Structure formats: C-alpha cells, structure tokens
Design a protein around this ligand. Structure first.
Ligand SMILES: CC(=O)N[C@@H]1[C@@H](O)[C@H](O[C@@H]2O[C@H](CO)[C@@H](O)[C@H](O)[C@H]2NC(C)=O)[C@@H](CO)O[C@H]1O
Ligand SMILES: CC(=O)N[C@@H]1[C@@H](O)[C@H](O[C@@H]2O[C@H](CO)[C@@H](O)[C@H](O)[C@H]2NC(C)=O)[C@@H](CO)O[C@H]1O
Ligand SMILES: [Mg+2]
Length: 376
C-alpha cells in the first residue's frame, strides 16, 4: 500500500506552535510526499512562495533518511481556480509549453513527479470541452514523461491527479477509463462531503451514508465515491482514498439540537492556528475535546462528532482512520492520502497521543514501515 502525505507551503505562516516546514516531517511515515502547491504563469509551472526553492530542497532532502521515499509537486488546488488551466489546455502549443516547463522544474528541484490538482475540469467556470482536454493533457504529459525517461536515461516522472469527490463534478470533469490508463495514481478527495455550506451538521468524511440518506445525499460518503471511480473505469490499485486530518465546524441554531442534520448558521468558528472559518486542524480539535466537549460516535458512518454549547464538529480520529484503513485494504485500493500532514499533532503536545497520531495510525495499518520479521 501507499501512504501519500500532502505538505502545504503556507503552514509555515501559522502562529506559534502551528508553524510547520519540511524538516518537521518524519521521513519514514509516508511512502510519498506531495508538496502543495506550485502555480502557473504564461502556461509554465512556477513557485508561489518567496522561499519555495529552499523548502523544495528541505523537502527532497527528506529522502536522505528514507531510500524508498518519493516526492511529487502538486500544481493548482482549490484556490487556484480554473481559468489558467483552461487557457493552458486550450491549444497543443500551450500544453507543450506547460509540459516542457514541468519536466525542467521537477528535475531541477528533485521531484519524482507531478500531481495535477485542477479543481475541476468542466466545473467552477471551466467550459465543457475541458473534460476531454484534461484527458488530452494527461495523455500528453504521460507520453512526454515516458520520452524524457528515454532521452535522459532515468526512471520516468510520475503523473498523478487529485480528483473530485462530488459526483456532479466527477461527471462533468473526467473521462475515467481513458484517464486511468495514463495516470499513475488517482488521489480521490473523499472529504469536505458535509460542512456549514449546507446549513445543517454533517460529517466531513463519513465512510458510509447516514441511514436516512437517499438520492444525491447518499453520494456523500467514502464508500460511494470510491466505488463510483472503481466502477466507472479506474483500477482499484490506482485509486487512493482521501483522509482528512482536520474537521469542519458549525454553529448550532439550538444547542439542544445536536445530532446529525441539526440546523446551523453561518460559516462555523475559526481556530487560533488555522484562522479560517469552518475548519480546525486535528491539533486544534484536541484542544476542544479536552475542554469538556461532548463526544459522540456516529456508528452508521464510522466517524466521530463532538459539540460544546453551540459549537459542533464533524471530524476524524484514530478510530475512524483505523476503520477506513481496514476498509480500503479489504476493497483492494492502492492506499491512502492525507490532507495534510501539517494538520496532524506533529509535536505530540496537543493531543497526548504521540507525534503524528493520525498519520502514524495509517502508517501502521497500511504496513508502511517495519516489517521487522519478528513478534511485536
Ligand atoms: C489535494 C487537495 O486537497 N487540494 C485542495 C486543497 O487546496 C484544499 O486545501 C486548501 O487549500 C487552499 C489552496 O487551494 C488554501 O488556501 C487553504 O488554506 C486549504 N485548506 C482549506 C480550504 O480548508 C483541501 C482542503 O480539504 O482540499 C482540496 O480542495
Ligand atoms: C462533495 C463536494 O463536492 N463538496 C463540496 C466541498 O468540497 C466544498 O468545500 C470546499 O472544498 C474545497 C475543495 O476541497 C476546499 O478547498 C474549501 O475550503 C471548501 N469550502 C469550505 C467553506 O469549507 C463546498 C463549499 O464550496 O461545496 C461542497 O459541495
Ligand atoms: Mg460496462
């Protein structure tokens, strides 16, 4: 199994003990590290932070303590939008400009591949032709990477993609059978499945549907999304399940109405380190739990929720990570990806569960480390 861990180049700006840079990563936890994000300018890949070149070196230097570790550079992300991708794929010339720039960039800075994070072809303003043009891009990139391996006499760069977990976006965006022939791995974003945007509480990454859910509400679970990809053309061994190391927050309209689906208002509270409404890192979650929040196991969906006064949190913990890791193994998927390692309790000092409690859970369940060949 693979354990793919995203690192974010803006975590460095978080205050106090929230600040996270590549040297804070345990090089042995994951099989692949993905650096989020590069940008694009004039159809060419580019850095975005003033110190990205320094961070790239620190990131790829982690391989000096793990001979099997591979790194990838992710381009795009949610906040990148779609227009630069639409322009870049619109012509063969723009695609070749981009592909050529990617090859030079990855080889110069020490990356083993590119993770395409266009959110999403065919949606959020991207026009319908982009569904097929995304496949064209990925095919041309895979073939260019194959040719560069021949020409440089090196193992070829990998091409992966982070892909939508919402069914409407999947249908509008991806020619799944053709894409799956060319991508090395498909990182399915099986999270952000519920949140304050809906106006009621729900879980961020439930494994299964809630018992009353029907129709399109019943798409909003890991099981359905992963099987949607599998049964529409993607091989299970290329499919990677998304695991969030954060939760979504809500304000209950009435503190006494605190189950799944209870009405909420506004965008949800922000945490002191991540400073974004509706979102708490796992280490921020532990601070909330320890202060007396009521904890509930959502048994049908295999995830926890918690609430205190009018604050409600849908999240993941060691138990839910364990259940979902068992599930992905028993369904023959290729492994797990985590968004993001800088949101785990990396110092071990917020949750009293050891360093990297969530990431370590997956490392153990997926057989990533050890193979010590004796009783443990
Ligand atoms: C691979 C992946 O998860 N890509 C998306 C991420 O971009 C997104 O994280 C958000 O990234 C923004 C840049 O696009 C940052 O500004 C923001 O702080 C960060 N976190 C958020 C929005 O909560 C993740 C989050 O689930 O999901 C994907 O959409
Ligand atoms: C299943 C599905 O498509 N859910 C959508 C959510 O992804 C989306 O939330 C946003 O997700 C982005 C992509 O990961 C994050 O970067 C972004 O922070 C997050 N927005 C908020 C407020 O948390 C929501 C809202 O746009 O829509 C759902 O339909
Ligand atoms: Mg068929």
């Amino acid at each position: 199994y693979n354990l793919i861990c995203y690192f974010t180049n803006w975590a460095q700006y978080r205050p106090g003990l929230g600040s996270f840079k590549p040297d804070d990563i345990n090089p042995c936890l994951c099989t692949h590290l993905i650096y989020a994000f590069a940008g694009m300018q004039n159809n060419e890949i580019t850095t975005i932070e003033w110190n990205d070149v320094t961070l790239y070196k620190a990131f790829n230097d982690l391989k000096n303590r793990n001979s099997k570790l591979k790194t990838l550079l992710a381009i795009g992300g949610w906040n990148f939008g779609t227009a630069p991708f639409t322009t870049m794929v619109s012509t063969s010339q723009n695609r070749q400009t981009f592909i050529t720039s990617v090859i030079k960039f990855l080889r110069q800075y020490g990356f083993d591949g590119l993770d395409l994070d266009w959110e999403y072809p065919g949606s959020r303003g991207s026009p319908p032709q982009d569904k097929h043009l995304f496949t064209v891009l990925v095919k041309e990139m895979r073939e260019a990477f194959e040719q560069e391996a021949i020409e440089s006499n090196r193992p070829r760069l990998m091409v992966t993609a982070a892909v939508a977990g919402g069914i409407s976006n999947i249908q509008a965006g991806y020619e799944i059978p053709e894409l799956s022939k060319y991508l090395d791995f498909i990182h399915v974003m099986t999270y952000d499945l519920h949140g304050s945007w809906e106006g009621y509480t729900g879980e961020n990454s439930p494994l299964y549907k809630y018992p009353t859910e029907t129709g399109s509400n019943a798409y909003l679970n890991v099981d359905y999304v992963m099987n949607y990809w599998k049964n529409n053309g993607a091989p299970a061994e290329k499919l990677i399940v998304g695991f969030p190391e954060y939760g979504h927050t809500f304000i209950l309209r009435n503190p006494s109405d605190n189950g799944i689906g209870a009405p909420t208002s506004g965008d949800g509270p922000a945490g002191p380190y991540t400073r974004q409404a509706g979102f708490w890192a796992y280490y921020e979650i532990c601070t909330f739990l320890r202060s007396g929040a009521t904890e509930v196991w959502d048994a049908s969906q295999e995830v926890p929720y918690a609430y205190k006064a009018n604050e409600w949190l849908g999240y993941d913990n060691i138990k839910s990570f364990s259940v979902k890791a068992q599930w992905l193994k028993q369904n023959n998927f290729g492994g797990a990806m985590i968004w993001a390692i800088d949101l785990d309790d990396f110092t071990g000092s917020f949750c009293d569960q050891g360093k990297f409690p969530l990431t370590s859970t997956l490392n153990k369940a997926l057989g990533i480390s050890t193979h010590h060949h004796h009783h443990h």
